[PDB]
Amino acid sequence: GDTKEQRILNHVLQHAEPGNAQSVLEAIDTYCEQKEWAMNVGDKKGKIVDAVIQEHQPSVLLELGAYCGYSAVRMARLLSPGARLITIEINPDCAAITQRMVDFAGMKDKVTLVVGASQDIIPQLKKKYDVDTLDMVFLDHWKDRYLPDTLLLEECGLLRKGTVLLADNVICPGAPDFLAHVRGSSCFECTHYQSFLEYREVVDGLEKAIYKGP
Ligand SMILES: C[S@@+](CC[C@H](N)C(=O)[O-])C[C@H]1O[C@@H](n2cnc3c(N)ncnc32)[C@H](O)[C@@H]1O
Ligand SMILES: O=[N+]([O-])c1cc(O)c(O)c([N+](=O)[O-])c1
Ligand SMILES: [Mg+2]
Secondary structure (H helix, E strand, O other): OOOHHHHHHHHHHHHOOOOOHHHHHHHHHHHHHHOOOOOOOHHHHHHHHHHHHHHHOOOEEEEEOOOOOHHHHHHHOOOOOOOEEEEEEOOHHHHHHHHHHHHHOOOHHHEEEEEOOHHHHHHHHHHHHOOOOOOEEEEOOOHHHHHHHHHHHHHOOOOOOOOEEEEOOHHHHHOHHHHHHHHHOOOEEEEEEEEEOOOOOOEEEEEEEEEOOO
16 A cells, blocks of 8 residues: 555656756645645745745755655755755654655755654754754644744744744644744744645635844
């Protein structure tokens, strides 16, 4: 047998162009529109992710939630030489898929994959992954972790003035406690980017929260 995540990977390996990150993204998006929905950020919201990366030019980018590697490929392809993406994924099989997808897309030199839970890895980023502060964070893991991991990132000293947090799914499925925190707090300057849930006409949005200092 096989799983949805394996079928998405197999579609890419068999139909996308090796070394062509854009072709990998398009193959995933086509498979998910035509065959089986999956929780990749997708094309519409992905254009917004792309725009945030282009506006901030992060040198150290952290992703929480890798899944099959769609967003890791999408983001990595816009980073400059010497920039790096650290992506944390709790499920070892998804992590294996993500590394296979990254490698196929020609992005392996940009990406450090970490297997584990964000809450376990964040407190180790400075000591084990040679992070000082982060330039940007993409939150796209289980939504009940968005608030507590944001507080962990801050308390661990990983945010600096101007660090960008970009959170998927703030409308659907929703992340209301995260939203109330960053919006209400004087420590974050927030902008809402409304769009659509991946591969659907359901409304969703992203929140961009720029840290302003403690
Ligand atoms: C929405 S999918 C990620 C999609 C990906 N960002 C993309 O756009 O291609 C969410 C993932 O977060 C992972 N996950 C859930 N809780 C986690 C945690 N605490 N730390 C790391 N990964 C987690 C899940 O195993 C799943 O792969
Ligand atoms: O249920 N969904 O439509 C989604 C969509 C998403 O984009 C997700 O990131 C998600 N999740 O992490 O649980 C779920
Ligand atoms: Mg999502």
